């Protein structure tokens, strides 16, 4: 419809390039090679007429030939060097045209990948977001396909038919043209329609083998139960059973693809020979001579070589087509939030974080966030303590924009968040994740992850603040080293060092954390509560803590109790009131 | 080698089977189809020979062929119908033999996986399970393939080159073995040297597709890092990078195949127009040769077809060929225990355990069993305590034989383990494992998975006893459901009630438990201990508990230190003297 017609338009321009002439020349390249190579490989069977011709008289008064050919042999040698140029003619063809397909389907998947990145995380939630790089590589190999196959098979083998069927309407009777008509016809609807057949049997085998080969994984894996007992009485028969099964698919298939075949051998078979025994009947007339007999053989059987792969190419084209669609289907996704066309610079005079009546619910079934009216004053650290029912998690989401606020406003530095750029938030927020992830490369680019385009003397005393730089400097190479998965295993605490490490080098005005819980000592936990202390000197901070021995640092706290407000203040006037930050300790320190 | 000899005797033992006539009779109506269809195939261009000759000589001498066709339309109509004998007959060859290749695959992937579910366990903890699967698949793909080649491909091609140049150099002179030898030569020699030559490319490729499809998951995967800053920057920048290689990689094998196949048009070309002109000359000479240029050309045109796909078939077959190899290393491994030719079934006449300073290390740089030389009494309970380093793991093991004792004595009702058959032994011990896991089958089916040819009241009485009966009358429906993965649920005390169910199922002279840590309240606990106190009233037991709250149930209790016994007795006279026990209940129940 409507979205195949965008989807061929955009392949168009992404395939053009009208602003560069080299993709331009390598085209006209392309179909010019394309139509020469057509023109010589109709040209041969001329040849060799005329040579047999020639022969038979002998044992020709024509002005072309005893003129650039003196004896047959330099016509025979003639049809050789025809047959060599059609063959480096497809030989350029295709190399040139590949060059630009392999192009376009390089700029085509940076694109889709660039946008996938730019879309909200309510659509990465959803799904398994492991399924989204196949569907990007099976796209681009369908892309690949399509135009290889629509370029490269189709419009080659439509120009042969048509220079084919000209040239046999013409120098000869009208009788061709119908024969070479229907034939050509008729084999393309029997093989459409037993490649639609072909496909149903095909898909049976693809399961049954599936099952097979699960079925088996399952068996082995479970090895010790089947030795404890019933030793191998049972499940080589099952096995045997699906392995059936896999055989009397793959027998069907065989036998439907030998009958596709042989009706197809059948079809050309007969076209071939009333097109031979009406010439025959031409020549024993006397209008026509011998040669065309062997014109006509050789043309039809050239015209045949390219038509034998129909079904294949038809199969592959079909899916290719469906794997192209669902690709650009991930493309013109629409974005849930978005920034105002009028907004402002974001200016950071001294935070002044500021709540008012807060309403969310991931899901409408279940509110988490009612009411929330916490105001944090400037450069004061206030702590979030609760239960997992309390909603902490979602404060730096609502604080970064992750989703956005149902009902309510907030007030960062005396300015709402709606009408001003998120990327100046972004940029002036700094977070601690509960369990950073250390990228598959060295510890010095992890570090400096945090703040491109940074000197090496500040990574590393940003490091030497840390207090990891000691650490650093036991591996076996100093700061280098392949770290995370496939490499060297660095501790939780190490990690979440690292982490510290990166949000300093950002050095935000506002800073969030979340105090994820592990089993770590006296010592380390004194050393972290050091350095995130030095960390929030001198910016505002909002602190979440599973363990709440390390809240009483902040200077002011807030309790939050199944997403509503209950009690704030210093923990000392909470011991004075009782209230339920008092219970909270009372199950929590004893 | 030696082994290559063998695998190729097994498999030609296994395409045979000269037991049922139904496979010989497909093999030698394969064989007739094929010299058959090459015959057939050979002759067809000999029919247009005969009337493109006769058919310039009527616009005389008899060769007395004039008798089977009158006219040469008749000659023009055998030409098709015995291009349709030819593909009738290719066809039906590659459906007889098809059948035999599908039947000799499926028997010898069911005869090495009944064979690798035979060897010892410490083989199958070295593998990494999977690993097997894969490889049981390739090598399968591969039997299919080489066989399917070697049969359809590679002898007939032979064939009709044999028979070509069989046809050749008689009827005509000697010149045509030597064009049809050595053009033929010279391109076997290119095909395999630029065949090698691209599959390195090719292995070159793949490598950086590879890459870039896991740095895009990697990339993926990891979204909250990336949004928090530096988004959209430096990633599609490296994603262009690994894009950029692919695409070169790409280019760089295209190229290469346009090559390979532009040098086998160009010898094929001029072998062809050679031996054109000197049939030409032939003919121009007044010699025999008459009119035939068209059956050389038609023959070596023929011949040309099926050397189209020579590298594909050469690098299919290679790789085959090496799959084949690892799958035939898969069998013929040797097991480390083996049963004795003068072993003897047990005999049961009241079980007695009897230990004799067993001595045992899975790695020989750390020993985990030291001379343990505990003796259980007949009908009674004993129990087995200690720490992780103890060693209580792989005493179930050792009575089942799983491994064998390096130096040592096992006395079962005053018979020694090592020299009586294992089935035995296997059928008389019943276990019940940590962790059970349930088939992906029907609950009925696991409940029967105890003792196969099982009557189901008997299954329903054993059920009800196991007091899992009410539990399973609660799901949608009745005694059949499917149960693990893809399926619902089961709880980790339903789990070990189906398993308990099971053992009790089989009903067996001794049995061994191992108390699986897990969360349970003290109903379901009770009700599980006096299950067990069931299973357990009237058989010899071996009891090991992580829990010590359970452990003096038993009747007598054996404490294990360092793979070591420290003391033994009831836990009354631990207490009165004091022993290790003691500590264990200090620091255990306080
Ligand atoms: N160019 C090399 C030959 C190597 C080559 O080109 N190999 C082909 C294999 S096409 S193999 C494709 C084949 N097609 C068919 O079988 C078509 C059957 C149809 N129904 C009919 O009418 O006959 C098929 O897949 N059938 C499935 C089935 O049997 O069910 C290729 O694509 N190479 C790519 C590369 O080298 O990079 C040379 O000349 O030396």
Tied chains: 1, 2.
């Excluded at 079934?365 to 009216?373: N, P, T, V």
């Excluded at 009902?407 to 700094?430: A, P």
């Excluded at 207090?467 to 995370?484: L, Q, R, W």
Aim: glycine share 6%; charged share 20%.
């Amino acid at each position: 419809a409507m979205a195949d017609m965008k989807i061929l338009r955009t392949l168009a321009g992404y395939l053009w390039m009208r602003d560069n002439p080299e993709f331009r020349f390598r085209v006209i390249a392309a179909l010019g090679f394309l139509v020469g190579a057509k023109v010589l490989n109709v040209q041969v069977p001329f040849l060799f007429k005329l040579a047999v011709d020639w022969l038979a008289s002998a044992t020709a008064t024509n002005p072309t030939l005893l003129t650039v050919f003196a004896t047959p042999a330099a016509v025979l040698i003639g049809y050789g060097i025809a047959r060599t140029g059609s063959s480096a003619f497809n030989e350029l063809r295709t190399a040139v045209f590949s060059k630009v397909a392999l192009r376009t389907i390089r700029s085509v998947s940076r694109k889709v990948f660039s946008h996938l990145h730019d879309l909200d995380l309510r659509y990465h939630l959803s799904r398994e977001t492991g399924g989204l790089n196949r569907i990007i590589d099976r796209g681009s190999r369908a892309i690949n396909f399509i135009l290889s196959a629509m370029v490269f098979n189709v419009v080659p083998t439509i120009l042969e038919i048509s220079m084919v069927s000209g040239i046999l309407a013409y120098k000869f009777g009208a009788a061709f043209a119908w024969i070479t008509s229907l034939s050509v016809g008729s084999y393309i609807v029997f093989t459409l329609a037993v490649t639609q057949w072909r496909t149903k049997f095909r898909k049976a085998m693809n399961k049954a083998d599936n099952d097979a080969s699960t079925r088996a994984i399952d068996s082995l894996i479970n090895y010790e139960t089947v030795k404890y007992f019933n030793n191998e009485g049972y499940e080589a028969e099952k096995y045997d059973q699906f392995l059936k099964k896999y055989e009397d698919a793959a027998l069907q298939t065989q036998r439907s693809l030998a009958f596709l075949n042989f009706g197809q051998s059948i079809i050309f078979s007969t076209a071939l020979s009333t097109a031979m025994v009406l010439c025959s009947q031409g020549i024993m007339n006397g209008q026509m001579t011998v040669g065309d007999l062997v014109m006509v053989n050789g043309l039809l059987f050239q015209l045949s070589l390219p038509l034998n792969f129909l079904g294949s190419v038809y199969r592959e084209t079909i899916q290719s087509l469906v794997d192209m669609k669902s690709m650009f289907q991930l493309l013109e996704e629409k974005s849930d939030i978005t920034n105002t066309s009028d907004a402002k610079p974001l200016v950071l005079k001294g935070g002044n974080i500021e709540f008012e009546n807060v309403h969310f619910s991931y899901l409408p079934e279940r509110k988490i966030l009612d009411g929330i009216s916490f105001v944090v004053p400037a450069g004061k650290s206030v702590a979030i303590v609760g239960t997992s029912g309390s909603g902490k998690s979602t404060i730096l989401r609502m604080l970064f924009r992750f989703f956005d606020t149902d009902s309510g406003n907030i007030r960062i530095d005396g300015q709402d968040i709606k009408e001003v750029r998120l990327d100046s938030l972004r940029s002036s927020i700094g977070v601690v994740p509960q369990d950073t992830v250390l990228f598959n490369d060295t510890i010095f680019h992890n570090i400096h992850y945090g703040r491109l385009s940074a000197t090496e003397e500040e990574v590393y005393e940003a490091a030497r603040r840390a207090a990891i730089h000691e650490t650093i400097s036991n591996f076996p190479d100093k700061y280098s080293t392949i770290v995370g998965e496939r490499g060297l295993k660095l501790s939780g605490g190490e990690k979440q060092r690292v982490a510290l490490a990166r949000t300093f080098l950002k050095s935000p005005a506002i800073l969030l954390c979340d105090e994820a819980t592990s089993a770590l000592d006296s010592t380390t936990e004194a050393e972290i509560l050091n350095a995130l202390k030095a960390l929030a000197s001198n910016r505002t901070s909002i602190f979440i803590a599973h363990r709440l021995t390390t809240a009483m640092q902040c200077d002011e706290i807030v309790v939050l109790e199944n997403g509503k407000v209950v009690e704030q203040g210093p923990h000392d006037e909470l011991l004075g009131k009782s209230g339920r930050y008092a219970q909270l300790w009372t199950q929590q320190n004893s």
